[PDB]
Amino acid sequence: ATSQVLHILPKPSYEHAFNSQRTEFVTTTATNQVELYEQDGNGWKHARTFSDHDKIVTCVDWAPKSNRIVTCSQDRNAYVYEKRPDGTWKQTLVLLRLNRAATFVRWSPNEDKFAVGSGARVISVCYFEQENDWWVSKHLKRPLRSTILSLDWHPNNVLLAAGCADRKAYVLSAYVRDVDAKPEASVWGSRLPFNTVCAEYPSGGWVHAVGFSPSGNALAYAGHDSSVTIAYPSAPEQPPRALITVKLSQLPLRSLLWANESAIVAAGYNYSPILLQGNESGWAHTRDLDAGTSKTEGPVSFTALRSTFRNMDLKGSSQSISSLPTVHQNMIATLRPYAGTPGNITAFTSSGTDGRVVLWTL
């Protein structure tokens, strides 16, 4: 493949999100600030910041249809941002009623409701009441046991894949009346009342991420044991047809994105993304998209010479510092789509603790 480094953030970024037109993107940093960036010719430049929160901002997600930004942070509060006609953005607090720090947020594919993961044993799902202009949260506390580490919606807009930190993968129905209509019968189930245990699957570690297939009839989750498991549901209260597990020889995976109806791209502490080709019969690692082991008479400038003396003085080597082969320098955060019709993705972006926002061109 081929990758282009979009920007070099000065600080680690655990999340990013692009607008529908892919014109400007929002990203988080280490502190309570949330950063905005816009294109400057061939590069990107700073746009504005948000200091509404008080503690470390955890996750940020952009709604492409309505062009809205939500932000859930460690301060147990959620802010929803909508741009004003003049150009500025209007903040709006959402009362999550949580007891611990939020961890992960996602917009529904219809963007009517958004679910919030949390370490307070619960998950908060919020919608908008036009009659009161209010956001109200509902707690999902029946089967949950540990911290929420990831979220994943379903194309039916009702099922919600929750990646818990109790070595068990969770799927729940987030259907709510007055917002969503009745959903069609699904392989996951048909009778879907609010807060019902759709499915439960085990793992060999904390479920860092979960993901439904583009067809919507599967789940893929990765534990902390560097193993990605692809689930194929059969019927309600019926064991899945096949639980394919692929075990790797690298660092544990972090986030999972579905390249197409039969391909999964996932990246973690290995500083690189991977690809999975297969079907119901099985799966296997296909290729290392990060070039693998690439290992990538003249005057000396004043800055270089000063650097050489500083390294010599503070050090005993005065040699090149890292020269790390992989494009990223630290653990990767997440993978999100960039362009293409559903089930047809060729470009997807990624962010990491090094601050690099590296687009990946399949």
Cβ-based neighbour number of residue 358 at 10 Å: 19
Cβ-based neighbour number of residue 282 at 10 Å: 11
Residue 180 interacting with another protein (CB under 8 A): no
Torsion of CA 288, 290, 293, 294, to 10 degrees: 140
| Contact residue for another protein among 39, 250, 277, 311 (CB under 8 A) | 250
* Binding residues for another protein restricted to 87-146, rule: CB under 8 A: 93, 95, 99-101, 103, 119-120, 145-146
**In the complex, least distance from residue 331 CB atom to another protein, rounded to whole angstroms:** 7
Cβ-based neighbour number of residue 321 at 10 Å: 9
Site string for another protein, 45-84 (x = CB under 8 A): ---------xxx-----------------xxxx-------
Residue 205 interacting with another protein (CB under 8 A): yes
Q: Select from 254, 294, 285, 286 the least CA-distant residue to 270.
A: 254
Of the pair 65, 142, the CB lying nearest another protein is at 142
Cβ-based neighbour number of residue 129 at 10 Å: 11
Cβ contacts of 224 within 8 Å, gap of 6 or more: 204, 205, 206, 208, 252
Residue 3 interacting with another protein (CB under 8 A): no
Question: H or E stretch including 134?
Answer: strand 134-139
Which segment (38-46, 150-158, 247-255, 288-296) binds another protein by CB under 8 A? Answer: 247-255
As a whole number of angstroms, the distance between CA 291 and CA 177 comes to 49
| Contact residue for another protein among 189, 214, 223, 233 (CB under 8 A) | 223
Q: Which residues bind another protein (CB under 8 A)?
A: 12, 14, 30, 54-56, 74-77, 93, 95, 99-101, 103, 119-120, 145-147, 165-167, 202, 204-206, 223-226, 247-252, 268-269, 300, 302-303, 305-306, 308-309, 322, 324, 329-331, 353
